[PDB]
Design a protein around this ligand. Structure first.
Ligand code: HEM
Ligand SMILES: [Ca+2]
Ligand SMILES: [K+]
Length: 267
């Protein structure tokens, strides 16, 4: 489909330069595209997902979006060099590049996302999920977004990369030992390890009995306790390829919620 008004070929490359110069920016780019989309209520059809509306207060000030000012600022260096691309397209693409760069699937990109002009269109607070809660909450949040239990488990598989930071979320640590890689090793960490309480972190989180260097959230481990979710956990933990297929589709679907009139990018 149509050729975009910015140089995506150069852009894809420059984004990798930024990530290679700062690997912890990789996982952080995924979170930024995802919480931008998460405000969506599909039943109410509001929230204004995928419009880079987290540029403006209050959505940028929401408790669930703490520390996301870092990837946003990082992408400013590239908004200047490529004025033709919207913030919305750039957050999404920076995230596709981050996932591919880290060993994940290559997602077909689509462009045409209109930016929110000001923070008058933001969604209400409380749309973002709480890691302290479990599957009833999780299933409530992903239902509202428009995902089924399968897509729900796949999307959370992204915790295969990155880590929690006390000063951001109150939680702490990586989910896996390869926190800059992107595969199914989250469903594998979840299934193989013995998740004991971490008594030294005030917000309740888990840790592996084997090394105690890794961590899990109540919202992460609720994927075990729910029978539906555990089916898909076993599935993705054994089938890395299917995880890549399913993550790619869902994250694409996610980052296209509330969007119309997009165009397939060439490669
Ligand atoms: C119920 C669902 C989810 C909950 C409760 C949750 C919770 C959290 C928390 C507490 C953090 C720590 C933030 C920090 O302090 O750095 C985090 C980070 C992160 N989240 Fe999730 N998350 C959920 C689903 C997802 C999904 C669907 C994605 C993407 C597809 C995702 C991607 C990430 C990534 C990549 C990081 C690492 C960020 C970094 O290392 O800087 N999460 N999440
Ligand atoms: Ca939003
Ligand atoms: K990894």
């Amino acid at each position: 489909s149509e050729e975009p008004p910015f140089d995506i070929r150069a852009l894809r490359a420059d984004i990798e330069d930024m990530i290679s110069e700062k690997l912890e920016l990789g996982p952080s780019l995924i979170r930024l595209a995802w919480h931008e989309a998460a405000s969506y209520d599909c039943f109410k059809k509001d929230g204004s997902p995928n419009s880079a509306s987290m540029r403006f207060k209050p959505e940028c000030l929401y408790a669930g979006n703490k520390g996301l000012d870092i990837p946003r600022k990082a992408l400013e260096t590239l908004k200047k060099k490529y004025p033709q691309i919207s913030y919305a397209d750039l957050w999404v693409l920076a995230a596709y590049v981050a996932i591919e760069y880290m060993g994940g699937p290559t997602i077909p990109f689509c462009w045409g996302r209109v930016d929110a002009k000001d923070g008058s269109v933001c969604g209400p607070d409380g749309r973002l999920p709480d890691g302290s809660k479990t599957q009833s909450h999780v299933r409530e949040v992903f239902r509202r977004l428009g995902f089924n239990d399968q897509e729900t488990v796949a999307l959370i598989g992204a915790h295969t990369c990155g880590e929690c930071h006390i000063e951001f979320s109150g939680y702490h640590g990586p989910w896996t030992h390869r926190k800059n890689g992107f595969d199914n090793s989250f469903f594998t960490q979840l299934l193989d390890e013995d998740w004991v309480l971490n008594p030294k972190v005030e917000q309740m989180q888990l840790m592996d009995r084997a090394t105690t260097k890794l961590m899990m959230l109540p919202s992460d481990v609720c994927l075990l306790l729910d029978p539906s979710y555990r089916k898909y956990v076993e599935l993705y933990a054994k089938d890395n390829d299917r995880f890549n297929k399913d993550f790619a589709n869902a994250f694409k679907k996610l980052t296209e919620l509330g969007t119309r009139n997009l165009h397939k990018a060439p490669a």
